[PDB]
Design a protein around this ligand. Sequence first.
Ligand SMILES: CC1=C(/C=C/C(C)=C/C=C/C(C)=C/C(=O)O)C(C)(C)CCC1
Length: 113
Amino acid sequence: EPARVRCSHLLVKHSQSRRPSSWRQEQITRTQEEALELINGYIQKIKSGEEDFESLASQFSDCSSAKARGDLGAFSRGQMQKPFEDASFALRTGEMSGPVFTDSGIHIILRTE
Ligand SMILES: CC1=C(/C=C/C(C)=C/C=C/C(C)=C/C(=O)O)C(C)(C)CCC1
């Protein structure tokens, strides 16, 4: 296991997120169910080739990392929320997760280093 991984993500918040507000939307109103449907739709379009992960993240991620095309940079264990960390360190470079749930919302993660 490396000391640190670098990842990009796409976050979809919902109305029960810890902070239901984002750079792109003043109040998050979507339900948890709707957030997961959006995440699963993005996964399916990335798999078919219809959409590019980094483009989708720039446009639609509720994390301010959207401006960096979803890049979070490098991190070790003990920093991020545990489910995010566990998913990230389980990926190979170039691999993308399924849905990952944290107190922030629902994530897709792409490990880049
Ligand atoms: C995603 C994420 C985390 C926190 C996410 C949240 C809460 C992001 C906030 C974005 C906005 C946009 C907040 C706001 O506007 O209040 C940490 C690093 C702890 C664990 C995994 C990565």
